[PDB]
Structure formats: structure tokens, C-alpha cells
Design an enzyme around this catalytic site. Structure first.
Site: not given
Ligand SMILES: O=C1C[C@@H](C(=O)Nc2cccc(Cl)c2)c2ccccc21
Ligand SMILES: O=C1C[C@@H](C(=O)Nc2cccc(Cl)c2)c2ccccc21
Lengths: 305, 305
Positions: B41, B143, B145
């Protein structure tokens, strides 16, 4: 989101760990520049540990009696000196893996990461707090002496702790990197009082702010209190008194959450007086005091090293 | 003595972390040999995340669109391929810091260390368990990921987890290093059921053995039980059923302590039915299930890497 007891990445410190042997005793040392630091009791036998005369024992030792090995690599010892409860072994080779570093004496209630080591090799890393009574509640077996505690700020490792001793009570005692014990302890195999511990109030409050940031909000109530009123409760429950300096340190978390520090104190008061009624906060059924306000912001803001 | 939630030393993994940027998205990658692994992603924009067509998005990208930076050092990308939910970016330079490593798919209830990273830089390390429902309860911000989970055996790092997603429920989902999600999850910004979780019974029993080794013995009782009887209780309290394979894995701890596994089950039954009555075990007021039997022995026997 989420909140874990997170340690510093240990790599910078892993590169400084060596094994030190003197006679039939092996423990860990810390190799920075051309000096290896280790607990002075490496020079003792079992018959010495009841009350070693360290000055007399060290006089019997020469440079060549200290075997220092860095992985598979033997270091040549060209000087030795005792500073308080640590030995400093001068070696002929600067550690090529030396990080930027400082030696710091930390305050009770501050936190740090411990890299537990045996035979100069890392076994694991964990975060803990210097208790108000200057003990630590660690995880340490025989051979762990010389393992160190540290903090990292950007690229600089601040060393604050070297492990020396497990007390008969099963808690842990050690020194700063100049060999000065935290607390009243001495490096001998005796029963030694640690004295009354208390809960680190400012850390508990920090963790309640972390809980709120993470959406655990059930313990927020309709009450406020005063420093005086709260401190009466603190006393009853063996909590450290809260000071304005603590309030000031909690300012950033107060601002982030919109919850005045004394309102959060009133929440804590109610938890102390009523318990948790079988509920949890951030995965804990106790009030957690091993996170500083700095810890909470760092973890909640994703600072790297 | 003492018992802590201890992570693996993170140094071997710190040397593999890089930053990967594609368009306006930056996350972490893992540089092993001449391949960089990262979540697919990285190629998405915010308008894509609701349901990305990954095949179509990736067709728009060329080698030169993937910016890979290892500290201050830019890597040259000479191939790209998508495998399940991961990208593999072939680079022209083998990572000089590559450890001995394996890719493993771990089982629910197993544990591992996570090295949380941002912008290819380590922020901290913590230990957790793969939940029975194939989520993890981590600490991760935007960030993070591409951060990875791992175990170490002597000099070999077994990579088991790469972080992809925080679910709307605030728990975490990710893949093995071949890009296959643990659990039913997909890499898109949707509400996704994780399904019923359960407590890892064999781990709880392991931790009760650790408590005994450490002198916390108050919960030992005069009772025994059977697998059938215990499993009826397990069911009521949303614990995993215990099998003879679990009993067999607990054998070494049974032998060390002299406490038959089914006797320890009877202790656990009483704790489930009566609660802890305001007491603690190894510093916890809950029953802890994030330590495997292997974890307990390792920590209690001081194994190094
Ligand atoms: O722990 C994570 C990784 C990031 C995430 O959730 N990305 C995401 C969200 C939906 C779908 C897909 Cl593929 C990726 C994030 C964003 C905010 C807080 C915590 C976190
Ligand atoms: O955590 C430690 C360090 C080691 C220790 O306690 N050494 C020791 C004991 C009395 C006096 C002095 Cl100076 C050193 C040990 C032995 C057994 C279990 C745990 C541990």
C-alpha cells in the site's frame, strides 16, 4: 494507537558489551572508547562476598589477570583502576562500535531500558523505572552483573545504570557508571534494607493521560480536587506527594487532552478510593507507574533514534 | 529472579530497516540481501485506500518511482514485484548488515518482538503475542507500516510479521514476509470483523509456572482436575481448550517445579472462578497470556543470542 511498555532499540548498546573474567568469576562489561567498565566484584571469590576488602583483593590482581573478550576477540588490558564500585580496565583498542554517549545519574521515578546480558552476549531488553527507594524490579540471573540501563536521545546513549546485585528480597540494586550505588546499598552478600517504597504519582497520571489519548476514558469523572486534598489521599495510599513541578511536567498532556491536571488527580483519587471494580485501563488491572510524562509523549508521537 | 516482558535484542534487525517512498507515501522496508520488502500500500493515495486496485496501481509505477534510503544512503532499484500484499524491490547492493535469517509463518498464541519504526528509523521494541483471532495488540502510529516482528535463535533472525494496518477497533493486522495476512484481513480502509478472541491457556499456565519459580505461590491450592473438567471451565471463560500437546509442551516447567500440569490447571480454574481477591501475580492483577512455555524457560535460564 495502543500503548506498550516499549524499550529503546538496543543495537547501539549491544556493540559495547564484552565479557570480563578474573580468576573463576565471569560477568559483563561495557566497552566505550578504550575503557571497559564492569562491577568491581568480578575480583571476588565466594569466600569474599560476605564482606570483601576490595582494596586488598584488587592489589593481588595485575592487568594480565583481567580477561576481556569482545565476541571472539580478546582485548589487551594495559591499565586498571577502581572507581567507587566499578573497575575501569584500560585496553589498547578503542571500541570501533562506540556510540555517542554520556554517563548520567538518574532521579528516582525516571525510566530506562535494560539490556540483560550473560557472558558478554545480549539475551533481552526491557523497560523499567528507578523505584523511589532506588531499587529496580528487573529480571536478572547469576551472570547478569555488568548489564546496563540506558536512555537514547537521537544518536546519543545516556548510560544510567550498571547491574550489581540481587537483594534477598528479590529486587535489584546497582550503580551509575561512576560506580556510585543508587540507594544505601553496598556490594556484599548481606541482608540490606531498601526502605519504604512508594508509587510514582506523576507517572500514574501520565499513564492515565495515555489511556485517554488511546480512548480508555471510563475512569474520567465529574470531580476536581486540590494539590493539598489530593496529597492527603496520596499519603494514605503510599503515593509520592505531587508538586507543582510535576503539574508543570504534565502540562503538554493536559493541553493535548483538554483535561486539567487537578481534574485528572480527582480521577486518580476516585480510583484509589474505589478500586477498578474489575475493569482495566490500557490492558492493566493495576495503576501503572513505569511511564514518565516524557515516555507517554514520545510513544504517542513516534520519536525515532 | 524477576520476570519481565522481555523483547529480543533488536540490533540485528535495526541494520535491515530502510525508508521506502512512492509518490507521497513513506513507510518502512526490510533490506535483506539485495531485496527490500515493504507493504504494497506504499503505492496508494488517500483516494485509493477505500478499495485499491493494487494490480492497476502498480502498473503505473516503474523502478525509479520507488525511493529507497538506508540511513543517508540511497539504494538503486532494479526490479519490482508484488507477492500477495508485499512488494519486493530488487536493489543493486546486498545489505552488508544482513543477518542469518528465515521467513516463518507463526501460529496463533506464539510471541515475537516488534521493532516499531518510522521513516526507516527505529523508535522502540516490545514483545507481544499473535492473538487467537490473528490480530496483535501493538503500539503503532501512522508511518509504522513495514515495521517487523521477529524471533531470534542464536544468530538467526526468524521474521514472522510485517505491520500493515490498524483496524477501526484499534488492534493491529499484518502479514508474514510472503505478504499473506494473518487472519481474514485485507489491505483496505474498511471495517473488518476480527471475530471472537480467546485467552491463550497454555501461556497462562506457563506464566503461573514462572510465578512459582519466582516465589509467587499464593494461588497454589489443594485441588486437581481433569482435561475434560478444566475445558468446561475454559469454555465458560473464553479460554482456548487445553490439549495433550499443550500438556506435553509444559512438561519441562512441570518437572522443574514438581507441580503436575493438571494440578496447575486446578489452580487456574480457582483463579478463573474466584478472581484474584485484590492480589497480584508477578506484578499483574490479571492473568497474563503473552508468555509461551519456551519464553518462560528462556528467560528463567538466561539464553543469549
Ligand atoms: O498502525 C497503523 C498503520 C497505519 C494504518 O492503519 N494504515 C492503514 C489503514 C487502513 C488500511 C491500510 Cl492498508 C493501512 C496507521 C494510521 C494511523 C494510526 C495507526 C496506524
Ligand atoms: O541479579 C543477580 C546478580 C547476581 C547477584 O546477586 N550477585 C551478587 C550477590 C550479592 C552481592 C553481590 Cl556484590 C553480587 C545474581 C545471582 C543469582 C540470581 C540473580 C542475581
Amino acid at each position: 494507537s495502543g500503548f506498550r511498555k516499549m524499550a529503546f532499540p538496543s543495537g547501539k548498546v549491544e556493540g559495547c558489551m564484552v565479557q570480563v573474567t578474573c580468576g573463576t568469576t565471569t560477568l559483563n562489561g561495557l566497552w566505550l572508547d578504550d575503557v571497559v567498565y564492569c562491577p568491581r566484584h568480578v575480583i571476588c571469590t565466594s569466600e569474599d562476598m560476605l564482606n570483601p576488602n576490595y582494596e586488598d583483593l584488587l592489589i593481588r590482581k595485575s592487568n594480565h589477570n583481567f580477561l576481556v573478550q569482545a565476541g571472539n576477540v580478546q582485548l589487551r588490558v594495559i591499565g586498571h583502576s577502581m572507581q567507587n564500585c566499578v573497575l575501569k580496565l584500560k585496553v589498547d583498542t578503542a571500541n570501533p562500535k562506540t556510540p555517542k554517549y554520556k554517563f548520567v545519574r538518574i532521579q528516582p521515578g525516571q525510566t530506562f531500558s535494560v539490556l540483560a546480558c550473560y557472558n558478554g552476549s545480549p539475551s533481552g531488553v526491557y523497560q523499567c523505572a528507578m523505584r523511589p527507594n532506588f531499587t529496580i524490579k528487573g529480571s536478572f540471573l547469576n551472570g547478569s552483573c555488568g548489564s546496563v540501563g540506558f536512555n537514547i536521545d537521537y544518536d546519543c546513549v545516556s548510560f544510567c545504570y550498571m547491574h550489581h546485585m540481587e537483594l534477598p528480597t528479590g529486587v535489584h540494586a546497582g550503580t551509575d557508571l561512576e560506580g556510585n550505588f543508587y540507594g544505601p546499598f553496598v556490594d556484599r552478600q548481606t541482608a540490606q534494607a531498601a526502605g519504604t517504597d512508594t508509587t510514582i504519582t506523576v507517572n500514574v497520571l501520565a499513564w492515565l493521560y495515555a489511556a485517554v489519548i488511546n480512548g480508555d476514558r471510563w475512569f474520567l469523572n465529574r470531580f476536581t480536587t486540590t494539590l493539598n486534598d489530593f496529597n492527603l489521599v496520596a499519603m494514605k495510599y503510599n503515593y509520592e506527594p505531587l508538586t507543582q513541578d510535576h503539574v508543570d511536567i504534565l502540562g503538554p498532556l493536559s493541553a493535548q487532552t483538554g483535561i486539567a491536571v487537578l481534574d485528572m488527580c480527582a480521577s486518580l483519587k476516585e480510583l484509589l478510593q474505589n478500586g477498578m471494580n474489575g475493569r482495566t485501563i490500557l490492558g492493566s488491572a493495576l495503576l501503572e507507574d513505569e511511564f514518565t510524562p516524557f515516555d507517554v509523549v514520545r510513544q504517542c508521537s513516534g520519536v525515532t533514534f
